[PDB]
Amino acid sequence: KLASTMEGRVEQLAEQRQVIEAGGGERRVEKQHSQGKQTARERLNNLLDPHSFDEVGAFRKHRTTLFGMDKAVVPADGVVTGRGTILGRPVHAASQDFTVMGGSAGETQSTKVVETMEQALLTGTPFLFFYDSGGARIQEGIDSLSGYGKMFFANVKLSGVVPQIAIIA
Amino acid sequence: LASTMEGRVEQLAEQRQVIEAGGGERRVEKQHSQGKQTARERLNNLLDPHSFDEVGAFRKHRTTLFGMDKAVVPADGVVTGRGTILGRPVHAASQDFTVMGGSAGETQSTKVVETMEQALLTGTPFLFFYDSGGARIQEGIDSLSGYGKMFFANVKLSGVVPQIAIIAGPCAGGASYSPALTDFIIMTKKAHMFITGPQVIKSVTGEDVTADELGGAEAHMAISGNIHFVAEDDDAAELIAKKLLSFLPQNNTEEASFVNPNNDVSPNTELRDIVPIDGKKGYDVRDVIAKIVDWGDYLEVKAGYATNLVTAFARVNGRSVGIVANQPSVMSGCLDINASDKAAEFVNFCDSFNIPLVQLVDVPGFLPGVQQEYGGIIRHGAKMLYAYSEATVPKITVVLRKAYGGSYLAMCNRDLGADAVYAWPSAEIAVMGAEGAANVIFRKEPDAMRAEKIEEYQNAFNTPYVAAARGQVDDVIDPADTRRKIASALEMYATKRQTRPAKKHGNFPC
């Protein structure tokens, strides 16, 4: 239910963006931290120049429905993507959120990653990706398997055109 | 020829003075009395002081029939050459009405085509002041051929170097097709343009119309859709031409030079209150444009034609951009035949000259009406879809409010290649209105069932969050951050390199 004024909706927007950014929640974030690991968003915030991150798909949602995916709430489908700068240089980046279903690669998540890579290719900028995952999302079966096929094809498409740096965290 | 060099130099000066006098003092006073500058005054006012370098002042016609053998026709009625505008090299032509009514002699057309070829060869803009009775009748098919060569040349230069036409007097007949083939036509209140004159119209159809009613600036702007700018007089046309040129590059291999950049991208909360949350209330989309572009500056193109859609040049951090925006305060912002043309032409031009396209969306669909269907809205609306799908410049779209079905796609969403799409919290992207939707999905089943199903369909698909859930918009944003969001996208996509399938050309709808 949307607020009656633009001001209300903007405040409403802010509250919703916060929920998404909280990812899997306090307990899981505490567990990530207790393991000596930063969160998906801390990694991007630490890597990119202060305030340069421009996120794409924060509100993106999976469309899968089997084995409980129809009721599951999966913030950003487990990956934070966008563009920013490093020492002023434009870059595109992705960061898997292990707090959201173990960072398992959902179909939509992989689509978000590929679109970000396609933008790096299109604009001729480097691409950096923080990996933190249990692999293809089992509940989505072949839907998530397809996501990886597209990702691998994209990695090769970018190979030798723009630098690609992977960080397994 | 004089006896000495010094003496021949003086002779040359006197001879050049005679040429530049054109049709003589009497005819020049008449031109001025009609509130028109002379061909040479126009070039002198347009170009930087003393930059004009003339070619062909002494060029003469070679025709001889029907009095031409004895006629004295200075520069054959046109002044051509090169100069600079704010330091930028340009080539230009300017018809001299005092000489045989500016009629287009064969040689005149050759001079014009040669100047056009030089503009192409060197990659500079080409500007032309028209003031003529059309093809010179005494030269029959010779003057006819000249026009054939001119039109072909306008097409050769199309999409390569910017072409600006300034109609500053009569433009009787087929000559009008040259301005049509250039990119922008600026018309003064002292100018007229038409394919068939009022007299011939009367003789053939019986219709009574004055030249003013038929093809004056207002008629072409508001009715015909033939021109891009209306100017009160020559001074105004000259100012408009320079302003227009300031947004464009020299040729298609470059992006326009930045001008007076305002690098601030701070938020402006004032943006939150321009678009009413109440769908039944309109507003001027230009108020939004003013708060997002540098210094609130913009040059609206075809401002008096199809006002249900705004097309304007402006700048963001000094970079030229073309803005296409629905105007909710006119015809509820519906797109129609004329606005589709107006938008498509603008999009194709910006794409040709590497000018990014920024869309401000608030469209409820295409205008309903038997005459819209009978007028071929199917093929005209397709022009928008074509232009945007073909365009490769950065395309940034911001949905302010309504975004319904095909009319939304026509405003360049992600599927038509927009590089970044943002939705305000008031964004209403939908395949169609919830009411119309229910009347089909739930045809079967009190009166509250209908109102209930409407709310159901509405919440399920038409909120900014569903659009974002599906990835149709990159983010939902605070209207206050609109400028920064556009500026950042323009910045990241400044290095965009996108290629199309190999082809001579696609088949653009007619």
Ligand SMILES: C[C@@H](C(=O)O)C(=O)SCCNC(=O)CCNC(=O)[C@H](O)C(C)(C)COP(=O)(O)OP(=O)(O)OC[C@H]1O[C@@H](n2cnc3c(N)ncnc32)[C@H](O)[C@@H]1OP(=O)(O)O
């Ligand atoms: C290809 C093609 C086509 O359309 O398809 C052609 O172009 S056939 C094109 C046909 N184009 C035309 O028939 C239109 C021409 N005539 C006019 O409608 C008008 O002249 C007008 C609206 C341009 C101007 O009206 P105005 O009263 O200001 O003036 P004036 O009558 O004094 O004229 C200017 C002087 O230029 C001469 N003059 C004007 N137009 C032409 C022309 N096309 N060829 C040869 N001479 C011309 C006039 O005879 C006159 O001569 P002087 O001082 O000796 O009296």
